[PDB]
């Protein structure tokens, strides 16, 4: 798994575009509790397939938030995966 950019001792779980940062859950809380300005940052779950990119699609059938590339790889695999309905997370 991609490491947290601040603590570099835990797997990242969220991605913050404004900070351009992959963060584990505790570092995410510490960074955005710092003040009201930071607390407005919108964050997204890190892809649960590759765990190295921000997720862009939620697939409830797979119970997985996936980045664009993992979403395409997983759902082109075969005709059952191809019918999965995903929710754009934007």
Alpha helices in 1-90 (DSSP H): 25-32, 36-39, 68-75, 79-82
For the CB of residue 90, give the shortest distance to Zn ion in the complex, in Å: 16
- In a 13 Å sphere around the CA of 1, the CA atoms on its Cβ side amount to 19
Q: Is 82 helix (H, G, I), strand (E, B) or coil?
A: helix
Each residue 29-68 as x (binds Zn ion by CB under 5 A) or -, in order, gives: ------------x-----x-xx--x-----x-xx----x-
Residues that bind Zn ion (CB under 5 A): 4, 6-7, 10, 16, 18-19, 24, 27, 41, 47, 49-50, 53, 59, 61-62, 67, 70, 84
């Amino acid at each position: 798994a991609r490491a947290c950019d601040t603590c570099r001792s835990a797997a990242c779980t969220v991605y913050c575009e404004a900070d351009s940062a992959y963060l584990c859950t505790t570092c995410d809380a510490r960074v955005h509790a710092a003040n009201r300005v930071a607390s407005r940052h919108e964050r997204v779950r890190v892809c649960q397939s590759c765990e190295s990119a921000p997720a862009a699609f939620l697939c409830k059938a797979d119970a997985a938030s996936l980045c664009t590339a993992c979403d395409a790889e997983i759902h082109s695999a075969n005709p059952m995966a191809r019918r999965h309905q995903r929710v754009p997370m934007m």
